[PDB]
Every structure is written in structure tokens, then in C-alpha cells.
Design an enzyme around this catalytic site. Structure first.
Site, PDB file in Angstrom:
ATOM      1  CG  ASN A  87      36.393  40.043  26.032  1.00 34.70           C
ATOM      2  OD1 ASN A  87      36.252  39.945  26.796  1.00 34.70           O
ATOM      3  ND2 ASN A  87      37.105  41.076  25.167  1.00 34.70           N
ATOM      4  CD  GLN A 129      32.108  42.653  30.664  1.00 37.67           C
ATOM      5  OE1 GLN A 129      32.621  41.612  30.400  1.00 37.67           O
ATOM      6  NE2 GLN A 129      32.803  43.572  31.296  1.00 37.67           N
ATOM      7  CB  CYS A 164      34.842  40.210  32.540  1.00 38.43           C
ATOM      8  SG  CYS A 164      35.925  40.695  34.069  1.00 38.43           S
ATOM      9  CG  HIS A 184      38.934  41.551  30.919  1.00 38.20           C
ATOM     10  ND1 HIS A 184      37.769  42.097  31.148  1.00 38.20           N
ATOM     11  CD2 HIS A 184      38.610  41.005  29.611  1.00 38.20           C
ATOM     12  CE1 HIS A 184      36.742  41.719  30.311  1.00 38.20           C
ATOM     13  NE2 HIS A 184      37.564  41.025  29.167  1.00 38.20           N
TER      14      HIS A 184
HETATM   15  C1  LIG Z   1      35.617  42.407  34.279  1.00 34.78           C
HETATM   16  N1  LIG Z   1      35.007  43.154  33.606  1.00 34.78           N
HETATM   17  C2  LIG Z   1      36.293  42.845  35.547  1.00 34.78           C
HETATM   18  N2  LIG Z   1      37.316  42.503  36.182  1.00 34.78           N
HETATM   19  C3  LIG Z   1      37.223  41.404  37.202  1.00 34.78           C
HETATM   20  O1  LIG Z   1      36.192  41.013  37.651  1.00 34.78           O
HETATM   21  C4  LIG Z   1      38.389  40.934  37.543  1.00 34.78           C
HETATM   22  C5  LIG Z   1      38.668  39.594  36.722  1.00 34.78           C
HETATM   23  S1  LIG Z   1      40.315  38.896  36.802  1.00 34.78           S
HETATM   24  O2  LIG Z   1      40.305  37.839  35.892  1.00 34.78           O
HETATM   25  O3  LIG Z   1      41.163  39.920  36.539  1.00 34.78           O
HETATM   26  N3  LIG Z   1      40.554  38.036  38.170  1.00 34.78           N
HETATM   27  C6  LIG Z   1      39.889  37.054  38.506  1.00 34.78           C
HETATM   28  C7  LIG Z   1      41.018  35.886  38.760  1.00 34.78           C
HETATM   29  N4  LIG Z   1      41.680  36.295  40.052  1.00 34.78           N
HETATM   30  C8  LIG Z   1      42.342  35.428  40.927  1.00 34.78           C
HETATM   31  C9  LIG Z   1      43.479  35.629  41.345  1.00 34.78           C
HETATM   32  C10 LIG Z   1      43.899  34.569  42.232  1.00 34.78           C
HETATM   33  C11 LIG Z   1      43.337  33.163  42.224  1.00 34.78           C
HETATM   34  C12 LIG Z   1      42.151  33.199  41.395  1.00 34.78           C
HETATM   35  N5  LIG Z   1      41.638  34.254  40.573  1.00 34.78           N
HETATM   36  C13 LIG Z   1      42.340  37.663  39.785  1.00 34.78           C
HETATM   37  C14 LIG Z   1      41.618  38.615  39.281  1.00 34.78           C
HETATM   38  N6  LIG Z   1      38.542  40.544  39.162  1.00 34.78           N
HETATM   39  C15 LIG Z   1      39.223  41.416  39.783  1.00 34.78           C
HETATM   40  O4  LIG Z   1      39.893  42.308  39.228  1.00 34.78           O
HETATM   41  C16 LIG Z   1      39.118  41.019  41.308  1.00 34.78           C
HETATM   42  C17 LIG Z   1      40.544  40.780  41.914  1.00 34.78           C
HETATM   43  C18 LIG Z   1      40.483  39.524  42.581  1.00 34.78           C
HETATM   44  C19 LIG Z   1      42.099  39.987  43.013  1.00 34.78           C
HETATM   45  C20 LIG Z   1      42.993  39.085  43.793  1.00 34.78           C
HETATM   46  N7  LIG Z   1      42.147  41.185  42.187  1.00 34.78           N
HETATM   47  O5  LIG Z   1      41.498  41.447  41.554  1.00 34.78           O
END
Ligand SMILES: *C(=N)CNC(=O)[C@H](CS(=O)(=O)N1CCN(c2ccccn2)CC1)NC(=O)Cc1cc(C)no1
Ligand SMILES: *C(=N)CNC(=O)[C@H](CS(=O)(=O)N1CCN(c2ccccn2)CC1)NC(=O)Cc1cc(C)no1
Lengths: 220, 220
Positions: free
Chosen positions: B186, B21, B27, B166
Site C-alpha cells: 500500500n 500518500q 494511490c 484503491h
Molecule cells: C487512491 N488513493 C484513490 N483511487 C483511485 O485513484 C482509483 C484506483 S483503482 O484501483 O480503484 N482503479 C484504477 C483501476 N481502474 C481500472 C478499471 C478498468 C481498467 C483498468 N483500470 C479502476 C479504478 N481510481 C479511480 O477510482 C478512478 C476510476 C476509474 C474507473 C473506471 N473507476 O474509477
């Protein structure tokens, strides 16, 4: 079934009085207990306010929640499932603070067997769930100055986004003067909006992200 | 059924080459395409890398996503459903930057009919989905130096939490002389970890939140 053109769960006695969260960011907890209160009325015939404070103090780190610093309705539901109960509001009152977990089964007023997350952004699926299941927990974008100042009518804010920050409860839907709406129960007390409610635009492109992250619990 | 003791979807020909990435926080987009890649193999017999860049550029504001500044696997799946397709990686290659939406149906490589969100925190349910459905998109807490520094074996971080940040892909599970793990793909390139993979502790109290927010897509 053909869905009803309008729904208001307050008409079936499934909605408790509006709560006041104060300066504690416990909206997620209020949203979750409100959804479960309806299911408890449908199951037992009795309307009972459930303890938002129990969720604040006990659905914590393990559930990705931060008490007065925000959380998830879904993970709140999962806490109630895992814990085999939630206390009544009368037994475990709201203090607008993070406290030690004081759950006691002798004060249990509800259980939860499961929860369902709706597909992202689908206002038709949200309508079906509100009509056929009950009130649905949702997040909205409540950041814009207009939201705080809402008094009446159907809220439509061109600056709204789908980046939601505020957990609320959809208790119905309908149309007012040619504008479709979602009937939303907030947790900022009766001063907010229409006695604590806001009618938010419906079928306007997932306005304010209302249909972004909907969920509802059920009881065995 | 009784579940197998170990699964590795790479042995089934359902996992593409590891992607890199770079400095773009995509991610979530890699996780989502990896999940869908497996379902496309199961449906069609073809193993094809799908366009993470299509998601970065096109599953944007309306989906609650922020491109290189992060997003959701679930809402990426919904974009693919709503859009009636996702392009091949070959046709819409990865740039590691936010771009205007360049989707073209003439380069469609997959569709998505639905996605499923697993109940919060249930490692048993995650094991069943990985065994019976396919690779599962998950979030993990990667906010610890040990994650960056991981080289081999079963990863266990005593300071890990359920505050996930992540997005990664569970492509199997097993044990290393009884040390249970999740096999995770990953998107930090082939030099990260075990040639792009990390084996993360399994059945250790939802370690690093791996079972907090799992989802998988399906194809008609
Ligand atoms: C990657 N390089 C950077 N991180 C993100 O894009 C991250 C991914 S995550 O896996 O942490 N994530 C996606 C899944 N998500 C969730 C919560 C509840 C239901 C379904 N999915 C939690 C976060 N994303 C983020 O950090 C964006 C984000 C969304 C939320 C609620 N918190 O962070
Ligand atoms: C209330 N006073 C403060 N607001 C919150 O605690 C807020 C509630 S929410 O309804 O806005 N919400 C929960 C549903 N959630 C989500 C996002 C993505 C996938 C699944 N579910 C959106 C946020 N909670 C938070 O702000 C905590 C949080 C933010 C995010 C992006 N994820 O969790």
C-alpha cells in the site's frame, strides 16, 4: 498490410440495426453485444442481434456492472466467456429495466473466447483494429449539449474531454469533406444523429476520449 | 512452468520503501510507479524510487486522471510511454498536492515500452503474472472500515465487493498456515498494516476485486 483509407462494417453485413436503450443506462451492454455481433457474423455468416438484457441482468456485481446504472464492455465480455454463452435478443428481449438473470443455454446465440483492450489513446492502433478485427467497443464523452443535438457532418466539440461516460461502437472510419472521422453506432434509437450514428472527429487529439478505452471480443 | 507456491518480490530486491500518500488520492500513481520500479530493477540492476508526483502533475486530463482525486494505473503507464520517460522520485519528490507539470528529461530514471491488462477476475492469471513477470498493479475495494483498521494476518471482509476504488501493488503471494493470500504493498505509509503491507485473501472468489483490473508495465 497498408490499412484501407476507409472502413464501414455495415457494408459487410456485420452491424445490426440501431437499438433504443430508453432511460436505462445500458449503453455498455449495447456496445458489447454490437462488437460480438460482428464477430458472430464473421464466424458463422449470420447476423443475429444479441441480448443486451442478458448482460444487464446477469453481468452484474461480480463484474463491476450496475445494470441500468452503468458498466463496462470488457467485464461484459468476460461474463460471456465465464458463462459459456449469451442469448439472442429475440429470446431475451430488452426491457430497459434491471431484472433477474434469465439466461438459458437453449437460447444461446454466441460465445466469446477472449477480449482485447487497446492501448490508451492510440488512434492509429484503433484504426488498425477496426480495419483488421472488426467493430470496437469504446467510451466517449457524451456530456456536452452539442452531442444530443448532432445531426450531420463530423462532430467536433471544443469543450469535449477525455473523461468518457458513454459506451458506443466504432463500426468504421473515413474522411468526409476533408475531415477524418470515426463512424459510431449509438443506442439512443434512430432519432439520434444520422439514423442512430454519429461521425466523430478522428486524429484530433483523442477527441471526446474515443480512443481512451477501446476493446473487442473474439470467438474461437 | 508449475508456479511456485509462494513468491515475495521484496526478496528479489525489486520493491522500494513504502510511501505515504497523505491526503492526496495518488494511490494510482504509487501503484504504477511501484510496478515500473520492479521492471527497472530487472532491466538495469538498480532499485530506484520513481516519481509518483510526476504522474500526479503530468498524467492528467488527457489520460483521464484527476491527480489527488484519483486515476488509472494503465493510463499512467501510457503517459510514461508517450512522454518517453518518468523522473526519479529524488529529482521530482512527492508533495501530496496537484501541481503544474515539472517533468524534465534530464532527470529521467525510467522508460516504459508497453503495458498489459489481465483478463477480468482471473486469480490464476494474476498468480502467473506475479510469479513470471513481476509485481502487478491492481485495484481493490477499500470502502470498508476493516481495511483502514487492518493490522496483521490474512484480510477477509465479508462485505467486500468487486467495486474497486484503491490502487495498490501485488508484490507476492503465499499462504499463512494454508490461508492463501496476495501480498499487497500500500501507499498509506509504514504504520499501515504489516509495516505498509496487507495480505489479502486469495482464491476466495476475487475477494475485494483484487483480480478485477490488474496490469503491469514492461521496459524495452
Ligand atoms: C487512491 N488513493 C484513490 N483511487 C483511485 O485513484 C482509483 C484506483 S483503482 O484501483 O480503484 N482503479 C484504477 C483501476 N481502474 C481500472 C478499471 C478498468 C481498467 C483498468 N483500470 C479502476 C479504478 N481510481 C479511480 O477510482 C478512478 C476510476 C476509474 C474507473 C473506471 N473507476 O474509477
Ligand atoms: C450508458 N448509458 C452509461 N455509461 C456507462 O455505463 C459507462 C460506459 S463507458 O464506455 O463510458 N466506460 C467503460 C470503459 N471505462 C473504463 C474506464 C477506465 C478504465 C477502463 N474502462 C470508462 C467508462 N460506464 C461507466 O461510466 C462505468 C465506469 C466509469 C468508469 C470511470 N469506470 O467504469
Amino acid at each position: 498490410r497498408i490499412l484501407p483509407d476507409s472502413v464501414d462494417w455495415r457494408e459487410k453485413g456485420c452491424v445490426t440495426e440501431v437499438k433504443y436503450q430508453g432511460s436505462c443506462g445500458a449503453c455498455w451492454a449495447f456496445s458489447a453485444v454490437g462488437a460480438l455481433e460482428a464477430q458472430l457474423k464473421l464466424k458463422t455468416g449470420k447476423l443475429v442481434s444479441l441480448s443486451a438484457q442478458n448482460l444487464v441482468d446477469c453481468s452484474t456485481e461480480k463484474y463491476g456492472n450496475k445494470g441500468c446504472n452503468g458498466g463496462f464492455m470488457t467485464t461484459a465480455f468476460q461474463y460471456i466467456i465465464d458463462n459459456k454463452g449469451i442469448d439472442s435478443d429475440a429470446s431475451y428481449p430488452y426491457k430497459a429495466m434491471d431484472q433477474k438473470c434469465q439466461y438459458d443455454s437453449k437460447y444461446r446465440a454466441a460465445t466469446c473466447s477472449k477480449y482485447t483492450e487497446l492501448p490508451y489513446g492510440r488512434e492509429d492502433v484503433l484504426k488498425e483494429a477496426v480495419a483488421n478485427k472488426g467493430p470496437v467497443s469504446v467510451g466517449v464523452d457524451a456530456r456536452h449539449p452539442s452531442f444530443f443535438l448532432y445531426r450531420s457532418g463530423v462532430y467536433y466539440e471544443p469543450s469535449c474531454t477525455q473523461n468518457v461516460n458513454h459506451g458506443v461502437l466504432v463500426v468504421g472510419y473515413g474522411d468526409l469533406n476533408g475531415k477524418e472521422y470515426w463512424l459510431v453506432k449509438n443506442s439512443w434509437g434512430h432519432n439520434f444523429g444520422e439514423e442512430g450514428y454519429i461521425r466523430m472527429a478522428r486524429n484530433k487529439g483523442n477527441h471526446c476520449g474515443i480512443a481512451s478505452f477501446p476493446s473487442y471480443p473474439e470467438i474461437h
